[PDB]
Amino acid sequence: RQMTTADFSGLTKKRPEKALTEALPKTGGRNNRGRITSRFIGGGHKRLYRIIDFKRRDKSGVNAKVAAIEYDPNRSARIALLHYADGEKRYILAPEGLTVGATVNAGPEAEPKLGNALPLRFVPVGAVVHALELVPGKGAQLARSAGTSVQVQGKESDYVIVRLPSGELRRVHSECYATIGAVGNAEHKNIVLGKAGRSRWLGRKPHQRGSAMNPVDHPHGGGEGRTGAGRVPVTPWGKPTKGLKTRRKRKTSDRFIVT
Amino acid sequence: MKRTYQPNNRKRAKTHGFRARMKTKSGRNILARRRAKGRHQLTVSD
Amino acid sequence: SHYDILQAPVISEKAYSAMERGVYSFWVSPKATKTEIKDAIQQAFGVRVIGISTMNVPGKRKRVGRFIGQRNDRKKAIVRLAEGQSIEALAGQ
C-alpha cells in the first residue's frame, strides 16, 4: 500500500501499532577523524537505536507473546516487541504474517512455526527462514532486511546448505540458530522516494558524478563537454566485474556463489 | 562585510594557550623558542 | 593573621556618609573570603557582624612615559553589624 496524489510526489508507506519505547541513543556521523571514509552521508533526521535480539538463546525453553509490532528507523524491518513469561521485554524483528499477540516459543525443541527461532538441524528442508546466525553463538548476520529470505537445503554432517537472498549457496552448520519465516516489512523496495531531500531525510547527498569533477579530483574529471574514457572509481579499479574477495577461509564454505 | 577576526576569549585561549602549548611538543618548542627570543611576551597574557 | 587582611578603610563621600548608618567599608586582601573578612572584622574591632558583601576592582592607568601603566588591583568589603555599633574612634570621622 501507498499514498497517491498530485502536487509533486509518489508513494509513502503505511504502518500500525504505535508506542515509541525503550532502548539506547544513536548519533549520526560520516567522516571518522580526517577525510571522510564512507562517502557522503552528512544529512539525516535524529534517529534512536533499538536494541534488537539477534542471539535469542538464553531465552531457550521460554515462550513469549507479541506485544506490538513497531516502526524503527535505521531498519527497513518490522520489529515485534516481544514479552516473555520471564517478564523480560525484548525487541525481535518481525517476519511476514507474524500477527500481534501471537505466541513465539524460543529454543531448539520449539516447532518450525512462525518466529520460533530454532537451529538448522531441526528445520525441515525447503523451509523459509530469516535472521540466520552465521557462527553458533553471536547472532544473525544473514537476512535481516525487508522481504529477505533464506531457503534450507539438504544438510551434510553438522553442516547445511542455505540459499541466501543473493542467490549464493552457503555452507552453514546446523549448530546455528535461525528464525522461521521470511522478514517482510511487506515490500519496502517499491516505495517511490518522491523528490530529493527525501533521500536526504535519511542518508544524505547522493552520487556526485566524477565526470563533472576535475582532473585533480577524479579520473573521470576534465575535458570539453559530457564524455568518457577509462571506466573507474576514486582510484582506477572500475565499474564492472573484478572479483574483490581475497582467497580465504570463508571461500571453502561457498558452493556456487552465482550472482 | 563580516571580517576575519571574531574575538571569542575561550577560542583564542584554547588554541594558542600556554596550556595548549603544553599539550604538544611542537608547542613546547614554540615556548622555549620564544623564551629564548628574549623576554618576548607570551601567549595567554596577550 | 587578624590584623592583616584589611588594607585600609574605604574613604570617600559614600563611605563616611554610610558610616552613619553603622556601615563600615574596608579594602581587604583580594585573596580572602567573606567568612575570613567576618572573623577578621570581629576580633579586630570586636563587634558581631550580620551584613557582609564583597567586590573586586581593576586599577589601571599611567602617569606618563611610554610605559602606560600596570594596574592597582584591589578587593573591597562592606559590613553592617548588630545593634552593637560604632567601630573604634573612627566612627567620628
Added chain:
RNA sequence: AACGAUAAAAGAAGUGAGAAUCUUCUUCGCCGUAAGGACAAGGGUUCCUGGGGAAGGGUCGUCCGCCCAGGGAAAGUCGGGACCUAAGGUGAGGCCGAACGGCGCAGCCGAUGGACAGCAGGUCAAGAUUCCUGCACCGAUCAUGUGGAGUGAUGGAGGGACGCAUUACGCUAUCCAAUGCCAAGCUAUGGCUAUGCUGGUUGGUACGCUCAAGGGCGAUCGGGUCAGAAAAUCUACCGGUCACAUGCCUCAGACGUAUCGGGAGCUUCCUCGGAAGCGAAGUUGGAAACGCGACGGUGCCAAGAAAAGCUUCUAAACGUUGAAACAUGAUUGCCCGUACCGCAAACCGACACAGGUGUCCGAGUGUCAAUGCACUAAGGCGCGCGAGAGAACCCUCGUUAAGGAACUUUGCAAUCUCACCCCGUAACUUCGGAAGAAGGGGUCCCCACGCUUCGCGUGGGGCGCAGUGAAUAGGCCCAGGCGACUGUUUACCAAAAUCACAGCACUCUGCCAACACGAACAGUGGACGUAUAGGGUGUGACGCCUGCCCGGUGCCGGAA
C-alpha cells in the same frame, strides 16, 4: 580635490581671553519592528564628579568616548562553580608504533542542554531579584516538644524523557472606547462655558465556605521463577476482584476582605535648581499572544539526546530505650561575574568608516490581516565644517506639445500595470494545473431600511477632474531553444543551458564484506547496517523508446 549619506534648522539667554559649533530656553525637522529599550558576545574604566585644552576631533571648541585627579561596581535565592551529562577532549590498566607518538574499556573534563530557594518597592552624581524597607523562601548544624520507631547504599527499579505540522476551550500580559470615577484649572480667536479640554484610573502578599475553563488519576490481594548479577515489601509480566456517568486530585485566572506598596498631582525651603512632606480613584464595556492553565486535542513520517537531582527497594552497617518524619526558635550562607558601551563614535572593519554582529521587548491611528505602509507616543536624534551663489557640466528627481520604439546589439532604462470585492476567463493538460490567463465593473460622503460581526446588503441623496482621493502596489500575450521540476554553484566580472535532483541501468560486496583513513597482524568509518543492504559508475521527472559492430582496448570464463 575632499571634510564620510540631501533627517534641517532658527532665534533668544548664558559662560568665556576667544562661540555658527559648549550650556539653558523656545520652536522647527528626523526615526519610531527604530535611528526606542533589555541582554549575550567582545571591549576595558570608556561610567559618575571636579578640573584641563598640547595632541586626538576631518572646521571650531570653553566641548568630548580625548588629558589629569578622585569616586563608583555590594547577592544563600539572578548567570557560572563547589551538581549532571552531549559531541568532542582525556584516559590507570590495555592495544599499536624508527623516535616524537597514534589508539583505547571504565572513569574524569566539557553548556550550546538537564537540575535548582524571592517577590514588591525605594533611592548615591555614578550599583541593584546585590544596598535599604516590607513581608518571603531553600538547605545545613544545634536546641525544645511530638514521635515514641527504623534509617535507607559506589547496587535494582520507576522517573527525569524530549519530533514536526495543525487546532478546541479558559485566561492574563496588554491595548481600546466612554456623559464611570478621580484630579487640575482655563476659557477668549466665530463658537463652546461643559456633555468641553487635559491627566491618572492599580502592583505584591495573606486569608477566604465566592466564580472558574482547563489539566491526569487507577487500587489492593496475588502466581511463577526461567526476568531486572543476588536481593527486595520494589519494577516487568501473568491472573482475580472494585475503575461503563461519576469522582477523588489541581487550581491558570477572576472575585472578595485585609495589608504593604504605588498613583495624577498638591505642599513646602530652594543654596540657580533640586530636596523633603502630602497623597485623589481604581468603574462598566470591548480586543488579545508565540506568555500561562497543561506533559491539552488531532493528524503525519522523515520516527524525534544523555546523565544527575527526584521517587520507590533492599545488600551492608548502626540502632531497635535516645529512629524517621513534622514545626519551634536559634545559628548558618563560601567562590566568581555584576560599572559603562553593547545593530554601535566604546565589538570585527588601520580610521568618531553609509559595512558586519546571536537573542528578547518593541505603543497608538488609519489599513481584509500584519512585525506591511503613511503619520505619530514613549524614548532617541538633526548624522562635528560653514556661509553665499543659482553658469557650463555631472548626479538623483518632477512635468512635458505632436508622435509612440522611428532609439538601439536588445524597449537597456524608464513608464504603463498595481490593493480589495464582484463578474468573467483560452489553446494545452500529467486533470493538480495552466490562472491573478485574457477582459470588464466597483471603491468617497450622508440618510433611510434590513443582516451575522470588525461591518456588510439594499435604496435614495451629495460632493470633486479624480473617491486602495496621500503611502505601501503584478503590465500582459503568442511563439520557440535548454533543462522536467524546489534547490546548488564561480567570497571579489559568469546564476546558466553548470552542479544536484527522484527515477532508471551496469557492476561490486556473504560480513573480521566490498570500499575507504592509517607509522599499525592498533583502532575507526562502512554499520551497532547484512543483498528489498552497502560501495562504484553513468544517465537524469514522466511518455513512447533504445538499433547494428565485439576486430582492437578492458572485464568475466576456460584449460590441451
Added chain:
RNA sequence: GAAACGAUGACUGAAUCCGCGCGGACCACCGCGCAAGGCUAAAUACUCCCAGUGACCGAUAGCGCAUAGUACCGUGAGGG
C-alpha cells in the same frame, strides 16, 4: 666490480688449542692476531657567562636595541 672485510632484517646454525678469525675472488705457503663480556683520566670541540686585548665600529656604523624583542604588524608560528 674480479668484492674481500665489517655491519644487520630474514633463514640456517660451528669448531675449540696439532682449535679458531685475518692478510681485498680463491688455494697452498708464509706472516699478523686470540672475537662473540665490562670499565676507563689526558691531548679534542663549543661559548650562555667572565677577563683582557684590537692597523674593529663610533649614532644610516656597531648586536635588532648607546637597551627593546619594547612600540608596532599578525588568529597564530612569526616578524620588528
